[PDB]
Write a protein that binds this ligand. Structure first.
Ligand SMILES: Nc1nc2c(ncn2[C@@H]2O[C@H](COP(=O)(O)OP(=O)(O)NP(=O)(O)O)[C@@H](O)[C@H]2O)c(=O)[nH]1
Ligand SMILES: Nc1nc2c(ncn2[C@@H]2O[C@H](COP(=O)(O)OP(=O)(O)NP(=O)(O)O)[C@@H](O)[C@H]2O)c(=O)[nH]1
Ligand SMILES: [Mg+2]
Ligand SMILES: [Mg+2]
Lengths: 166, 166
């Protein structure tokens, strides 16, 4: 079947693992549990086609330097996550977008900027500015909540459809 | 606020009204009830921005000839619906795609092909062929169910994001 190689990327503590666990195992993890690397494979059906989602869950900071080169090389699509209450995680997004362009020799590489944690009332990153960043890059922007499950299927599936259309 | 002028288009009986009612009033209509025109305005929030969705619910066949010219003129985005158990409604999609290009003087006009009724087990339109049609046009393809609510927020919101990015 079609496999879709997704890698979820972004800063430490943004919720990429609680995103991937909501999708894969339907429940919110409120644990402190930093990732070196976790891989989830799941036979799924998206718009009538069956496919296996092969998600790679990555570390926020880690040793992880040109040591990211290797997974952004194999990955077809990227979820670029930041949290809407962490202004620096929003700013580090240019670090990941460019390095993914550098290792991929591409300017269009299927991607989607995910503003996570939109259940929390004290936010510091307005959607207007986050939507501009995503329009600057020619990329979809989607706000999520791994607490509430708001938009997690939407981030994942829009990204698969971005790969389908590239 | 941003308003988003959506018009839902496609053949008679495909479920465009049960799509719009699922979205607007959360319930499945299993009624025989043909549309001349219905308009739904709803303040909503999509990815942190508040906006009013101004949906125009249209007739499948009707008198409706160059009398469609007027709404495809005002509309910003289109949901092009067919049902996955009605092969001719899948084929009439080129009628609507071209006329929307003709009245809009455009080749990229925000749109999304919706394969409705994916709860029903006897289907005649494979997703593979429907996904090709949507890749031919450079358009998202999304399967829905107004019975089950599967994918109705996904058809509507992907379409708003298509307008945001155009
Ligand atoms: N309120 C709220 N909390 C969330 C959300 N997603 C994750 N969290 C919380 O945020 C913290 C970090 O979550 P985690 O998913 O481990 O983040 P990570 O970005 O994957 N961390 P790492 O970079 O080290 O791999 C946890 O306490 C988790 O419960 C969300 O949508 N909203
Ligand atoms: N099983 C199933 N039935 C549906 C679905 N959507 C609509 N229906 C049924 O299909 C029939 C036609 O629905 P309707 O929404 O009125 O279609 P329309 O395309 O809007 N008709 P018109 O072109 O005349 O405006 C109704 O009996 C309705 O209950 C769906 O997702 N699945
Ligand atoms: Mg993690
Ligand atoms: Mg109708």
């Amino acid at each position: 079947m079609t496999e879709y190689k997704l890698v979820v990327v972004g800063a430490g503590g943004v919720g990429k693992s609680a995103l991937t666990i909501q999708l894969i195992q339907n429940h919110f993890v409120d644990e402190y549990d930093p990732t070196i690397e976790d891989s989830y494979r799941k036979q799924v059906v998206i718009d009538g086609e069956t496919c296996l989602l092969d998600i790679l869950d990555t570390a926020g900071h880690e040793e992880y330097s040109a040591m990211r080169d290797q997974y952004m090389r194999t990955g077809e699509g990227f979820l670029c996550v930041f949290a809407i209450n962490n202004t620096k995680s929003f700013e580090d997004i240019h670090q990941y977008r460019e390095q993914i362009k550098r290792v991929k020799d591409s300017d269009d590489v299927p991607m989607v900027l995910v503003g996570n944690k939109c259940d929390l009332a004290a936010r510091t990153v307005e959607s207007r500015q986050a939507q501009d960043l995503a329009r600057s890059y020619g990329i979809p922007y989607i706000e999520t909540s791994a607490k509430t499950r708001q938009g997690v299927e939407d981030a994942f599936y829009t990204l698969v459809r971005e790969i389908r259309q590239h």
